[PDB]
Design an enzyme around this catalytic site. Structure first.
Site, short mmCIF file in Angstrom:
data_model
loop_
_atom_site.label_atom_id
_atom_site.label_comp_id
_atom_site.label_asym_id
_atom_site.label_seq_id
_atom_site.Cartn_x
_atom_site.Cartn_y
_atom_site.Cartn_z
N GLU A 148 0.77 -1.25 0.00
CA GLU A 148 0.00 0.00 0.00
C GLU A 148 0.80 1.30 0.00
OE1 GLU A 148 -2.76 -0.35 3.23
OE2 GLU A 148 -3.50 -2.30 2.50
N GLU A 258 -5.80 -10.92 -1.34
CA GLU A 258 -6.59 -10.87 -0.10
C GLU A 258 -8.08 -10.83 -0.41
OE1 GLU A 258 -5.16 -7.58 2.22
OE2 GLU A 258 -3.06 -7.99 1.70
#
Ligand SMILES: [Mg+2]
Length: 353
Positions: A148, A258
């Site tokens: 991220e 994910e």
């Protein structure tokens, strides 16, 4: 509905297309959870046991217990292993960002001293990565090198998340993380940049330009990790496809890392209070979504090597925390193809066929 271990293996069904993985915790490697894992998956990832603060909470102090247990499970059951994660702005120890005087580096105002903090942080990052890689390089089949680092908006022209890493080093920490991972893991190790909302602009384009720029400067990046924390109607199948195709066009591999399909929008309010409160219409909509989703993954299986669910069955998912958080402490989501009791859901049948 039959139990998960009484239906066809998801791993076997997609063996010609991609791995089928699951995020796990050290305490879910036995019992029914362990049985389901061995039966349906051929890849696993640590939900928390391998984040920065979980491995080196204090400089020089490494806690390998949680991670070793997960790695041991992988070895004994011949499963692939994704490493999550070498770099992130969350679940990361504070000591990384403190100068030699004990003050946070982001406060330093002397250009030369800031320049010195950058080098110190990078050296610390190099040591963290090297220590970890040396210990698990023979078990890891994919590395979430950085996590991220792209922003959801555009705080800067390059759309980079202005986390503590960026404030102190700009984009150098990203370059160093990859260069160090390649160094100690070997040329064959697959290095990924992981992130969420990779299907939507401008974030998707910011990540795209980032990998291009870095690839042009010789930074060793092999693929893009798509967290895929999605909904039933968002992002669209086309947004997902377009994103994966763009990175494939750059020679990069893709992996869904994910995956969870929430029954709610964002925020997840109002959410159903309990699992039994969820009407069948919801599970059917989720089923149609999973079918479309895996048909897409299959269609693009030439540029998709692995699809990992951020969990096993509906009894354990971080989406429940988000649900309670927005519904005054009460709420239940149901993102997987297996329910709280490990019984298959309509979504399972729609992706096994
Ligand atoms: Mg289907």
């Amino acid at each position: 509905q039959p139990f998960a271990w009484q239906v066809a293996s998801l791993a076997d069904r997609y063996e010609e297309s991609f791995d089928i993985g699951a995020a796990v915790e050290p305490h879910q490697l036995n019992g029914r959870q362990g049985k389901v894992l061995k039966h349906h998956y051929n890849s696993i990832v640590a939900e928390n046991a391998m984040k920065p603060i979980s491995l080196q909470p204090e400089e020089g102090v490494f806690t390998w217990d949680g991670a070793d247990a997960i790695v041991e499970f992988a070895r004994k059951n011949n499963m692939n292993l994704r490493f999550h994660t070498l770099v992130w702005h969350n679940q990361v120890p504070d000591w990384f960002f403190l100068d030699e005087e004990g003050n946070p580096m982001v406060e330093e105002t002397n250009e030369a001293k800031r320049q010195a903090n950058k080098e110190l942080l990078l050296e610390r990052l190099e040591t963290h990565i090297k220590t970890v890689v040396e210990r698990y390089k023979d078990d890891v089949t994919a590395w979430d090198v950085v996590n991220e680092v792209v922003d959801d908006g555009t705080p800067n022209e390059r759309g980079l998340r202005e986390s503590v890493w960026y404030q102190i080093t700009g984009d150098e920490y990203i370059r160093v993380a990859f260069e160090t991972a390649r160094k100690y893991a070997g040329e064959d190790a697959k290095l990924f940049i992981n992130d969420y909302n990779t299907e939507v602009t401008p974030k998707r384009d910011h990540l795209y330009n980032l990998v291009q720029d870095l690839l042009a400067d010789g930074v060793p990046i092999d693929g893009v990790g798509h967290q895929a924390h999605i909904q039933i109607d968002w992002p669209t199948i086309d947004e997902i496809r377009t994103s994966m195709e763009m990175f494939a066009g750059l020679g990069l591999d893709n992996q869904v890392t994910e995956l969870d399909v929430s029954l709610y929008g964002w925020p997840p309010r109002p959410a159903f209070p309990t699992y039994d409160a969820i009407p069948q219409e919801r599970f059917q909509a989720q089923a149609d979504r999973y079918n479309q989703l895996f048909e897409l993954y299959e269609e693009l299986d030439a540029d998709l090597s692995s699809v990992t669910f951020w969990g096993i069955a509906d009894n354990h998912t971080w989406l429940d925390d988000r649900a309670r958080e927005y519904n005054d402490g009460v709420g239940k989501d149901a993102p997987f193809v297996f329910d709280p009791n490990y019984r298959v859901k309509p979504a399972f049948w729609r992706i096994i066929d």
